[PDB]
Amino acid sequence: STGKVCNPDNPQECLLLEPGLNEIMANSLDYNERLWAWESWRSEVGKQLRPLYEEYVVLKNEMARANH
Amino acid sequence: FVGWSTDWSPYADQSIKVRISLKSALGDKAYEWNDNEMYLFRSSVAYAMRQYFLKVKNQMILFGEEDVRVANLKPRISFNFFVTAPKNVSDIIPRTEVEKAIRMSRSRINDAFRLNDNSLEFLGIQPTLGPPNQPP
Amino acid sequence: QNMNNAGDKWSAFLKEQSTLAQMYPLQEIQNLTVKLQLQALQQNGSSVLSEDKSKRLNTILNTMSTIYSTGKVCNPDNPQECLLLEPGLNEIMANSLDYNERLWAWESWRSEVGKQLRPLYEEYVVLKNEMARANHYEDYGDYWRGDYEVNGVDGYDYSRGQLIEDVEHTFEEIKPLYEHLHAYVRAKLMNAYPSYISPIGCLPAHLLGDMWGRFWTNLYSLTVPFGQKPNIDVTDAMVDQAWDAQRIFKEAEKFFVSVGLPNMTQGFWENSMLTDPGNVQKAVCHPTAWDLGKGDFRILMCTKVTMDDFLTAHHEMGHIQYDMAYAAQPFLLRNGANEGFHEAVGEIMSLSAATPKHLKSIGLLSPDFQEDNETEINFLLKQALTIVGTLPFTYMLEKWRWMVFKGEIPKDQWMKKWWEMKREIVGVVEPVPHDETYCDPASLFHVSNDYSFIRYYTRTLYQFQFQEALCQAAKHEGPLHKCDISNSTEAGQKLFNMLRLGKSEPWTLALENVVGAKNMNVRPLLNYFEPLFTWLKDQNKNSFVGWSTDWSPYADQSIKVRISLKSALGDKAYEWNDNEMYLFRSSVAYAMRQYFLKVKNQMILFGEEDVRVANLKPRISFNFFVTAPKNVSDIIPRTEVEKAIRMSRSRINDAFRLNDNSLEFLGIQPTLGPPNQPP
Amino acid sequence: INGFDLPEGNVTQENFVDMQQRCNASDPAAYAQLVFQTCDINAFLSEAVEGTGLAFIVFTEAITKMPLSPLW
Ligand SMILES: *[C@@H]1O[C@H](CO)[C@@H](O[C@@H]2O[C@H](CO)[C@@H](O)[C@H](O)[C@H]2NC(C)=O)[C@H](O)[C@H]1NC(C)=O
Ligand SMILES: *[C@@H]1O[C@H](CO)[C@@H](O[C@@H]2O[C@H](CO)[C@@H](O)[C@H](O)[C@H]2NC(C)=O)[C@H](O)[C@H]1NC(C)=O
Ligand SMILES: *[C@@H]1O[C@H](CO)[C@@H](O[C@@H]2O[C@H](CO)[C@@H](O)[C@H](O)[C@H]2NC(C)=O)[C@H](O)[C@H]1NC(C)=O
Ligand SMILES: *[C@@H]1O[C@H](CO)[C@@H](O[C@@H]2O[C@H](CO)[C@@H](O)[C@H](O)[C@H]2NC(C)=O)[C@H](O)[C@H]1NC(C)=O
Ligand SMILES: *[C@@H]1O[C@H](CO)[C@@H](O[C@@H]2O[C@H](CO)[C@@H](O)[C@H](O)[C@H]2NC(C)=O)[C@H](O)[C@H]1NC(C)=O
Ligand SMILES: *[C@@H]1O[C@H](CO)[C@@H](O[C@@H]2O[C@H](CO)[C@@H](O)[C@H](O)[C@H]2NC(C)=O)[C@H](O)[C@H]1NC(C)=O
Ligand SMILES: *[C@@H]1O[C@H](CO)[C@@H](O)[C@H](O)[C@H]1NC(C)=O
Ligand SMILES: *[C@@H]1O[C@H](CO)[C@@H](O)[C@H](O)[C@H]1NC(C)=O
Ligand SMILES: *[C@@H]1O[C@H](CO)[C@@H](O)[C@H](O)[C@H]1NC(C)=O
Ligand SMILES: [Zn+2]
């Protein structure tokens, strides 16, 4: 909810997902701008979530086996 | 046509295939190909791209190892790679210019890995030059 | 835009009347008053450039101003918390006592912002040099030095090149006092950051109390001479007598009447913002004095009941008394004599109102109170952290900008000359090395917002010249720092004969109406801090006074490299450009990744940006050290980098076609190999 | 070269003595730790070896620096 992505040419304008990065993916017809928003969202957020999720899966499998 | 083929890719026509034969160039005295050797390979390609744009086009473009995108890694030791602009993922450098940059620095990439031009092949870049005019 | 439609109405009236002023050349005017107004009106400014060069320059100036105010820096561990400079990153550099947190905020501010400003500023300098040459100046620094120029007033002249010689002349006399303050602060900082500061070297740049080391005033809680004695503060006696924000402006009004200056203006007493409203009525609280015209003088400040808001009232009312004195002058000649006189008159009022001799007669500071000679040392060292600690910084920065504008520093040597002048003049060393991708001077406000900086040097020298001359007319007996000019009408007459001039006369003549000389002088500043200079020389008996420009915070974990290309190859030898240094930083980062995987079984993602290179030479030599991947405070120790290089030395040699004698590491020698040939 | 940071092919035999004084006029107290040699021919040609050393410690040292050492 708080991770944001900013522009290569202007690093002072950073967009959150829920306003601004969704309106690019819903309204733009520019191939290059849609590819920037798709890939740069997966980068940072992507990686953080990576280790987080790994730990998550591990812990979640222990709760379910103790409930048979 | 109804249906899809799982082989086409948006980056597949600007990729170059690499094939590495470690146990034929060395045999024994041969190292193991981990992820640290792929980092050195992405740095030698980024070195070779910086030199070509400086001596042919007189531009200074700061290519990094993160601009060399590697796909389809196998045990035989093969992968595809393409090169993008330093912070513009939409700008793929064309394949005919990456072929000229690799030709300029092929002897320098071979020495960094102890391979010699037949155990490090690029599949579409073949070595050309060299007259054997020995006797005077 | 109720004021922008009035402001653009005024900005356009000037350029209409400026072209009409071109009809009267200056070689025929004999009257000096009508000549001085025409010089202010005939100057072209940026109206002399091309039509698309004048809009390229205004775009760079708006871009550099926006990167400064909106650029932010976030945390390595949590990338979602980003801090701006003006809140949050200044409070780290002013309050933290953690070496690692201060080093993060210092370095990460210079990175991003640094680089952007780099190219911006390059373009900037280029464009700025074209505007000044079309206005018949040498460069843009000569344009800035034209505020101090006097031409042909028969014995009061002053060149634009004479300001460079008078600044360097007065600076060589402040240098003994600054070295004893430098050596005292260094010894006290060694008790706060042990094993980080050398007892004979420079001071690390991130430990100085703010982001740039412009003032050393936040170092007072670490460097106080007698910590158990408190300073004189009357912020609690003002509440016991219930002083509101109208009595403290009536006390400032009585201070100026006592020296002979007039009262306020009824209109003034009527209009003013002497207190904060508090409700949804908004407004700016910065303390400002206003000179709206036709006898309208107003002051706007959110006035609390504190000791320094009592002092700021004396400072701002000195600006009003200066504006009230040249109100009989023409409109173009209504300012100070130069840019430094206006803020120097305001600071000798708050200097004389803060003395305990003054406060015990105003109603505060109970009448049986004898001040100790240990609180006078506490008072003087707090003054020297702000006054004396800023003078080598101010001199070095304008000297760097004056030489960049005239071309004596080439564009590939901007950052190399910046840190050589900081180690030599200021005694301050960088904690990490910086190449020509940085623009560390442009990370200050005044550099990226296009302001001259020599006015803060000359104002400091005029301030003690005015105070020493006004305390001789008031017949002061003891030291200069206890002086009070109140109840002396003959001292308020020497001040008023300079106050009433404005820019009607040269500034060399307005000095002689007060101090009895024509040039700026540094001996009254040295007489002010004379009881502190005696005490500092006794505290520095066993210490070393001075600094060596060779010690560095990263110098004991560096490794020297030496490369001999034409001996290993001879011919068939390549040229060592910056692309070969990138491959060298990648081979060291490769060698660090392999050592931590096969000896310690950790996966640490070293990059080429973690290999920090310093001291590059033609022979082909440099020093390098390796840091953690995104932690600049974590330097990998040298004995572990020596083991990583030994493991992969044959692999680094093959990448460059060198063989172990043309690529040496100076402390890593090859060992192994028995020559047991025959069976 | 290891003390004054000069290029490689810098300061050959033709320019030894003039580049000795360019360094000490550039910066003193860095020439005082430099150890130079006073080696010159007619001192390397003038050893008095005789009787067995002209074949076992003089002639066989010059053979090792030739092209085909184990044939000469
Ligand atoms: C990133 O690279 C792409 C090229 O793939 C750039 O796109 C070009 O943009 C210009 C104007 O913006 C167009 O006239 C070109 O037609 C575009 N190229 C293509 C192939 O469509 C894009 O501008 C680059 N982005 C940045 C920030 O430099
Ligand atoms: C320079 O010119 C100004 C006019 O612009 C002169 O000022 C006038 O001086 C006379 C007598 O000194 C006064 O009666 C006028 O009122 C002044 N004019 C204004 C507008 O105030 C000034 O005297 C001239 N200077 C010299 C040295 O002749
Ligand atoms: C200010 O700029 C102008 C450029 O417009 C300079 O040139 C004068 O321009 C006027 C037209 O407004 C002409 O009538 C003059 O002949 C021009 N002078 C010259 C020497 O070409 C003007 O000289 C500049 N003024 C100053 C004081 O620098
Ligand atoms: C300036 O001088 C006046 C008078 O010489 C001082 O006013 C006297 O203050 C003392 C104590 O502060 C009182 O006992 C007297 O009654 C006051 N005299 C009058 C006539 O009111 C004033 O304090 C002096 N100001 C300073 C700053 O020294
Ligand atoms: C403040 O003044 C006092 C008294 O003049 C000084 O104290 C004396 O200093 C001398 C010098 O070493 C000693 O010999 C005496 O024994 C001290 N007197 C006492 C009672 O201890 C003091 O040094 C002064 N402090 C400053 C900072 O100047
Ligand atoms: C960056 O590296 C420094 C080491 O230089 C780390 O500082 C250590 O922090 C721990 C707890 O935070 C202390 O117990 C150690 O004493 C510190 N080391 C030193 C030498 O003082 C710092 O934590 C690292 N930062 C990150 C984000 O990992
Ligand atoms: C200043 O104003 C006060 C009234 O507030 C008046 O008594 C005093 O005489 C005035 N000062 C002078 C110099 O007239
Ligand atoms: C040695 O260095 C000097 C200094 O620039 C240079 O002028 C000279 O050409 C160099 N000598 C050689 C042989 O390169
Ligand atoms: C530099 O050293 C040499 C060697 O002793 C000496 O002859 C020469 O005078 C020195 N240079 C100067 C300027 O003293
Ligand atoms: Zn002010």
Residue numbers in the entry:
A (entry chain D): 128 to 195
B (entry chain D): 603 to 738
C (entry chain B): 60 to 738
D (entry chain A): 345 to 416
Please share excerpts from the published article on this structure.
A three-dimensional (3D) reconstruction was obtained at an overall resolution of 2.9 Å from 418,140 selected particles. This immediately revealed the dimer of heterodimers’ architecture. Homodimerization is entirely mediated by ACE2, which is sandwiched by B0AT1. Both the PD and neck domains contribute to dimerization, whereas each B0AT1 interacts with the neck and TM helix in the adjacent ACE2. Dimerization of ACE2 is mainly mediated by the neck domain, with the PD contributing a minor interface. Extensive polar interactions are mapped to the interface between the second (residues 636 to 658) and fourth (residues 708 to 717) helices of the neck domain. Ser709 and Asp713 from ACE2-A are H-bonded to Arg716′. This extensive network of polar interactions indicates stable dimer formation. The extracellular region is highly glycosylated, with seven and five glycosylation sites on each ACE2 and B0AT1 monomer, respectively.
Full-length ACE2 consists of an N-terminal PD and a C-terminal collectrin-like domain (CLD) that ends with a single transmembrane helix and a ~40-residue intracellular segment. ACE2 also functions as the chaperone for membrane trafficking of the amino acid transporter B0AT1, also known as SLC6A19 (25), which mediates uptake of neutral amino acids into intestinal cells in a sodium-dependent manner.
